[PDB]
Amino acid sequence: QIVPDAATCPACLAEMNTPGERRYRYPFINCTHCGPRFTIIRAMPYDRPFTVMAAFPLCPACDKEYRDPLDRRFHAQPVACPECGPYLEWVSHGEHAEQEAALQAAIAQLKMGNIVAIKGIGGFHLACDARNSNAVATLRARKHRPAKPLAVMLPVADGLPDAARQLLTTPAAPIVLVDKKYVPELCDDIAPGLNEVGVMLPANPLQHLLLQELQCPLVMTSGNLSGKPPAISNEQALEDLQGIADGFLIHNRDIVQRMDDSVVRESGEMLRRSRGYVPDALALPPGFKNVPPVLCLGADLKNTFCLVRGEQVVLSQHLGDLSDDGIQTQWREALRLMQNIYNFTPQYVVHDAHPGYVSCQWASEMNLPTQTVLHHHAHAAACLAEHQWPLDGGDVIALTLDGIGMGENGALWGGECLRVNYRECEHLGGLPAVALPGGDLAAKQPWRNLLAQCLRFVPEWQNYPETASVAAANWSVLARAIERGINAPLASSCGRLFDAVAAALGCAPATLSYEGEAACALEALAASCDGVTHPVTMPRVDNQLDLATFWQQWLNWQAPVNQRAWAFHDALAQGFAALMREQATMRGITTLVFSGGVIHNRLLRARLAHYLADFTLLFPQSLPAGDGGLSLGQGVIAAARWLAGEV
């Protein structure tokens, strides 16, 4: 029974700070209670000969500790000291150092405002002084990441709320999203236009040495290139990061598994589940038992896979976007080790109903019986699973809010009201389906969605100040592609509705640099408002929200932009609450489920919980609301159809 990778413990930290200890200032100190696990194992059993540490025979001082039953390092599989262990190496445009001098060159570079690649437990990070405006602009410029927020490493948790401090200091040592007023020391280019910052504490010996020296916050972001899987070997770091890093702090212990930092909110809500949680298994809900081995391929974005057997499920670490160049290698190594750890051999494969997905191509290469699950059915089921809804617990009404998933009959869904149990998904209503002009471009340029909404719902849209940039363009070639159905598929996407509103308000750049950027900006804007009396609504017309009425009231209700953003969330929540109410009540349903990437929105949650106080409300918490949780939903639906003896 192997455990997730564990933050360095107090006792090892104390040993590493104590002059005259053999392991004094040694960056690879670990013991039976802490250190790398999943990231250093080649095969089972967990035993030094089958880890990355086979290469380093123990000196005798270490071997006496590893073998002594009453010793903290008894069978510490990756134990070492300066005599027999891995050592640090510094590489900078010509220059070379090792061990302690390697550490000092990295610190001197960080102190002068340079960017250093640092080798971690499960990848490589890029670091620099988080208070240094020039360093941070340079890092963003070199990595072409003009907006996306950067995680920051702090030396200690002092001054953070209690609930943050308590999460930050667990073995898992996650990034924890914290209000940015707690951390005034960070320059303004850390999370521009957002309200929260991701902070973490040192969790490995090398990070402790660095932060003990620097006594200041450090950007500590992933060592990759957009479109590329993160490097896990020295030469792939050297190759990948040379345009970016001014120097490299690497070492000669191999990483064999990609393992990103995990990311939670202070409230405990999981956004990314990797380092420190993988590979822990999860109990399935009551009634699921004797389930055959099922491999669930998850989603094409923010991918995780899932192994289902017996009365448990095991989720992989975050593996990213599956359409990326060589991401299949890492996926496949995670799958090998996971199957070796649990002695797992799949009898069935489950994957998404979208036939253009990479994951559905991989699934047909496996010579197993395969089955398909609707994207939004799976969202809803991951959420019921996580709240321990019983196999036979009854129907719920689900609100599934996201970007785009394939729905029934080739339709693109993302704002749906559903009747849901673990076997069935009936679509009840939701947003109107509205063109995505330019297909994939619709997610990158919010103004296209504003245009598609205006064309369908706003008479004389050209006359509103909020449509000015749109109207000054020759939008009418795009309007004709839309009429004729040329790369302008219909989608009831709630994510594309956020984008239309954000473009109307002008709160995002015209072209976006990351998925969801316009929606986060809109939500960060709405959250500075404490609530307003306003006349904006989204009425119900048969079983869909009436956006003609919404845009007419919204475009004609002048108010500060935060109050306009707040009013949008409120009308949307209210409008969905009215739909879910009619559907639940007239069927005798008393429990409501919410899932999909948009449900990560705090204001929209708070608003829906406000309108739906007459119901039991079920929201994601220990698993991501979005695509990170989808493999689990696939799993419980396949298990449930199986348990019912479905052919």
Ligand SMILES: NC(=O)OP(=O)(O)OC[C@H]1O[C@@H](n2cnc3c(N)ncnc32)[C@H](O)[C@@H]1O
């Ligand atoms: N190539 C690539 O994907 O970059 P990456 O994955 O290293 O991005 C950092 C991750 O930390 C999270 N994160 C960090 N700071 C955040 C903030 N202020 N608000 C929301 N999410 C944040 C967020 O989920 C984000 O994906």
Ligand SMILES: [Mg+2]
């Ligand atoms: Mg503070």
Ligand SMILES: [Zn+2]
């Ligand atoms: Zn320890």
Ligand SMILES: [Zn+2]
């Ligand atoms: Zn030794």
Ligand SMILES: [Zn+2]
């Ligand atoms: Zn989704």
